[PDB]
Structure formats: C-alpha cells, structure tokens
Swiss-Prot record, chain B:
Protein location: Nucleus; Cytoplasm; Cell membrane
Annotated crosslink Glycyl lysine isopeptide (Lys-Gly) (interchain with G-Cter in ubiquitin) location: 130
Organism: Homo sapiens
Active site: 128
Protein name as annotated: Serine/threonine-protein kinase B-raf
Shown part of the complete sequence: 449 to 721 of 766
C-alpha cells in the first residue's frame, strides 16, 4: 500500500510549535490531523534522512497507545501527518495544571503507557525520549505516546538514565534507558512531582545522577501508592542498566497490581 | 510486516460467533480483538476472504476506523484489531434508550462522516454501514467497523440474500434492494445508509417503525413507494440536518451528495452549535 498524501489535500491551520524537526500545525484532512512540516527551500541530506527515519518508524506502528501515523508528503515540503490529539500532555496535567487524578486513573495511565512501550520494544523501536511531555492524554483518557518535542511544552535531563546523563559513550541509549525514563514517569504519577524539585542547578543534577549520588526521593509517593507500584518504580530506576526489568515484565506487573485494587 | 507470530496473543473470552467466524477478546501488548475465520484447515474461500479483509484493513489509518493491528495464519487464520469498549450506536439508540444531547448527536454524525470520507478517499466502499457498525468507543470516539462480515458469500443475485442480510435491510439503498446489477453497491449506496443513520440520530427511531414485515419493506422500497417519515425528527433537529438527510436518501443514486460535502456541512453545523 501507500501513505503518500497528494499535494493540495491538506488544509494547514494553526501553528502549534516546533517538533522534533520542523514545525507542527493543526490541519484538516478527512477530519482533524496534525502536520509536521519542514519549512525550507531544499532539505539537507541530514533532514531528508531524519524525515525518512521518522516515516519508517511510524509506519511500523499500529497500536492504540502510540500516536497514529496517517501519511506523508515530500513536495513542496517534507511533511508527516498524524492524528490530532485533543487535550494536554501528562506533563501539563501533573505539573502545570496539577490535575488531581484518582489512584485508579494514575495506575491506568501507567498501564496504558506500559502497553505502548511494550509494543514499541516488541517492534524493535527504542523511543529515546520518553517523558511525561511525550505522553498525550487524548480526550483526557487514552494515552498516546509520541515524540512531540516542543509542540507539547535539557528538557529531558530528568528522565535520563545515569548512563545517558553521564555521556558515557556516543550512543548510550537502550531499551533499559527507556525503562528508566518510564520509572521517572511512574515517579511523576505516584508523587505528582518532578524528581529533584529542590535541586536548583542542572549541572549538579547531571553530575550527581550520573555518579549515583542523587536519585529520586521515593518518600514523596502518595500514601495510597500501592506497594507493588513503589517496588516496580524502584526496579525501573535501578542505577545499573542491566538490573532494570523489560517491558513485558513491567506490563504484566502493572496489569496484576491494577487487578488487585479493582 | 503485520504478521503476528504464533504464541504471542493470549486468546481470552469468546465474545460472539456467527457467519463472520468467532471474535475473542485477547491480550497482545494490551487489549485486542481477535477474529478467527476457521478451525480446521482453511478452504480456498476462507483463505481468500482472509486475504481480502487484511488487504482492505491494512489500507486504513484513521481515528474513526477500527484500528487493524495484525494477522496470524497458524493454527487459525486470525485478524487482530484494537478492542472497542462500549456499545454500538444501534445498541444505544434502539436497545438502551440512551438520550443524547443534540451536540453529541451531531458529533456522532460528524465522526461517522469523517471515517466515511476517509474510506471513500481510499476508494473503499464499506457495503454495510448501519448503526450497529458504528461503535461508540469509550463513549467519545466513533469507530466504524464491519462487525458482521460473512465469510461465505453467495454467488446468486436474489431473494435468499435478504434473509442472511435481514440485519441490514433498513439501511439498503433502493438500487441495492432491487439488485438489478450484479454488484449494486457504490459510494452512493454508502451515502444512503448514512442518511438512514442520520434518520436514527435525529428521530431516535428506526425508519419504517410501523411496517410490520421485511418483505413489505423490500417490495415497497424497491418500487419507490416507501420512504422514511422525515417529519418524525425531534423538535430540536437542526434545519441543516433535515435537508442533508433528505439529500442522502435520494432515490437516484447520482443525486446523493458525496462525503466531502456531507462532512463539510456537518462540520459547519457543529461550529454553529458550539
Ligand atoms: C514512534 C515514536 C518513537 C513514538 N512515540 C515516534 C518517533 C518519531 C516521531 C514521533 C512523533 O510523534 N511524531 C510526530 C509527527 C507529526 C506530528 F504532527 C507530531 C505532533 O507533534 C503531534 C501529532 N498530533 C498532535 N496533536 C496535538 C499536538 Cl499539540 C501535537 C501533535 C509528532 F509528534 C514518534
Ligand atoms: C474497513 C471496513 C470497511 C470498515 N469499517 C471493514 C471491512 C471488513 C471488515 C472490517 C472489520 O471491522 N473487521 C473486524 C476484524 C476483526 C475483528 F475482531 C472485528 C470485531 O468484531 C471487533 C474488533 N474489535 C472489537 N471490539 C469489540 C467487539 Cl464487541 C468486537 C470487535 C472486526 F469487525 C472492517
Ligand atoms: Br500500515
Ligand atoms: Br419480518
Ligand atoms: Br427488521
């Protein structure tokens, strides 16, 4: 089949912000869409490769908790077209609005995020930038994982595993670094706070997290955080990469502990 | 690319069986639905039905179309899609006495029109649009599916069709009822079915509620002597929907509007109501 959308069909609307490359707009194409466009005369080879990589990855995904890819265009500009997400990111809800979710809902958000991540890893896709700003709460209820960059909101230091934040080597990312980022998301859900909220300097966070002398303060977890969720968070946040669990185990554990409440 | 290896899906509760095969709830990176088409070695018919359904579904990526997720071929031919949670529009309107506000009735029409506009843009004729194939997922997003697609298909254009397709008679365009072409289905017959959905939304009733048997409906819709009673729309029915419904139900198929136009009209109404 083919996902190329002919020029002229999409009506490009309000500008939302910068994406992971290019600029994101709300658009119309058989309903609402998002359109991420590279607004340049001619793309560099690097820009073309980034576009191709993103289309290549997105076209491999069909899951309710992954942003729905819908098509692309290459002329007159490189564009990636996806569903429109209605609502706000998890970051916005937790930290900006400080939305007060019930524990059942917090655990369901964790569950849905774990399903999306389990799916990506099953498809051999590393996210590399999981964080609450990249977890969209569509229609205030269905998690959509994306890589929205600035459209939703250095901006990712708090979710970086120690091996990533240490800049250990030229590509320190793995499924296990995604797991660590998911541990930080669990921290955000279960505490309603960002980690290191009282550390005022980013360089200090970089040095101390990387050395293992700073880690998230698990005393901040809400009093009705289930013990099994606290333990799972601690496993996801293990400082040594190879000690962290895989997503199939994470997901199974969340599904179990969710049943136990309900 | 979309083949799911055997062993990965945990096939759970059986939800329903019929001419479509058997649908189960399952687990595979979260909830899924799994439709199995055979139990023993598949016939060539079953295999071609499977291939066609995967081929149609893999052309679709739209929020208002049931999300295809994958397939398996052993030990059973299986089509894997998202799980839908909730009830169909038919169940709401006709089995549950759900009372939707007008803004919500129009949003249902709007999301249905988006999905149908999309299918038609992809050159896909649905062939069985009706309120029971409009799923109100999490009561907030419409998912159009074909939740009763029969695997075995008759070769004979005639009168035993209407027994098996008894669940769809109310949504069949007159030229579909008459079967004067070997395949009388078109984009325009999908539009007619959408007209009947609009009727359901704006009246809260099925068409032909006082006609007491299907044979009479087949005969009279085919002859042009029975039409839905458009006067029965509820007092809050927008004027735009009265006109639009009548246009979708036009007897001459080429006089019905296309989905781009239908969608644009409903989007304008939704703005006016908001
Ligand atoms: C598969 C994976 C690894 C994940 N996960 C991945 C890899 C690379 C990129 C993306 C990725 O998500 N791309 C992407 C493309 C086009 C867009 F418009 C947007 C985009 O900002 C939006 C798409 N709907 C939206 N509704 C609302 C708002 Cl405010 C923004 C958007 C977008 F983020 C995802
Ligand atoms: C694109 C088009 C023309 C449309 N529109 C079309 C053509 C042919 C077939 C289908 C089609 O939809 N197939 C299909 C395949 C697998 C399934 F499990 C189910 C299925 O009953 C369900 C899929 N989730 C479900 N949640 C809950 C419940 Cl109760 C049932 C299901 C299913 F209906 C759709
Ligand atoms: Br695809
Ligand atoms: Br009857
Ligand atoms: Br009937």
């Amino acid at each position: 089949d083919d996902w190329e959308i002919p020029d002229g069909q999409i009506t490009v609307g309000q500008r939302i912000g910068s994406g992971s490359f290019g600029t994101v707009y709300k658009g119309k194409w058989h309903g609402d869409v998002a359109v991420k466009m590279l607004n340049v005369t001619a793309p560099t080879p690097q820009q073309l490769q980034a576009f191709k990589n993103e289309v290549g990855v997105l076209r491999k995904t069909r899951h309710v908790n992954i942003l729905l890819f819908m098509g692309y265009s290459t002329k007159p500009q490189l564009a990636i077209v996806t569903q429109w997400c209605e609502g706000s990111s998890l970051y916005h809800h937790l930290h900006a609005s400080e939305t007060k979710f019930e524990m059942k809902k917090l655990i369901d958000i964790a569950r849905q995020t774990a399903r999306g991540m389990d799916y990506l890893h099953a498809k051999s896709i590393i996210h590399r930038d999981l964080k609450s700003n990249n977890i969209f709460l569509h229609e205030d209820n269905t998690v959509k994982i994306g890589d929205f960059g600035l459209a939703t909101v250095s901006g990712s230091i708090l979710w970086m595993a120690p091996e990533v934040i240490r800049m250990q080597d030229s590509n320190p990312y793995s499924f296990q670094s995604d797991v660590y980022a998911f541990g930080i998301v669990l921290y955000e859900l279960m505490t309603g706070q960002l980690p290191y909220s009282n550390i005022n300097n980013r360089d200090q966070i970089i040095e101390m997290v990387g050395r293992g002398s700073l880690s998230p303060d698990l005393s901040k977890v809400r009093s009705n955080c289930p013990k099994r969720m606290k333990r799972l968070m601690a496993e996801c946040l293990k400082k040594k990469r190879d000690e962290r669990p895989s997503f199939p185990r994470i997901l199974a554990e969340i599904e179990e502990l969710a049943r136990e409440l309900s």
